């Protein structure tokens, strides 16, 4: 019914250049790979996330999937505990989510 998630943002400014996009996507994809191979996601957020909750491991707590931005909710369809989703692009950059738990 509800999911517990954490988030990481690899930032991009408005109207980013190709060089900026390629760098951010590369870093985001590498973080996804690390997270899918056992790296502590909260510590990856502490080290790399630009979002305001980075120091708290990007924790989002528990919630209902459809209340999140559609780009997140859609990507979380049928996701299982431990899944890493992303990179997901939006105007602010590349997003990565970890499904910490489900209940």
């Amino acid at each position: 019914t509800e999911l517990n998630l954490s988030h990481i943002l690899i930032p991009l400014p408005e109207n980013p250049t190709s060089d900026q996009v390629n760098e951010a996507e590369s870093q985001a994809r590498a973080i996804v790979d690390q997270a899918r191979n056992g790296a502590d996601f909260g510590k990856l957020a502490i080290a790399h996330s630009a979002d305001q909750q980075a120091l708290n491991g990007g924790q989002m707590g528990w919630g209902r999937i459809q209340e999140l931005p559609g780009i997140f909710a859609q990507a979380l369809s049928t996701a299982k505990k431990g899944d890493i989703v992303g990179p997901i692009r939006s105007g602010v950059g590349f997003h990565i989510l970890k499904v910490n738990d489900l209940r």
Binding site: Q53, G58, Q59, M60, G61, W62, G63, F72, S90, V92
Partner: peptide, 7 residues
């Protein structure tokens, strides 16, 4: 949700 990032 306790926190929802901006997109």
């Amino acid at each position: 949700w306790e926190y929802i990032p901006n997109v």
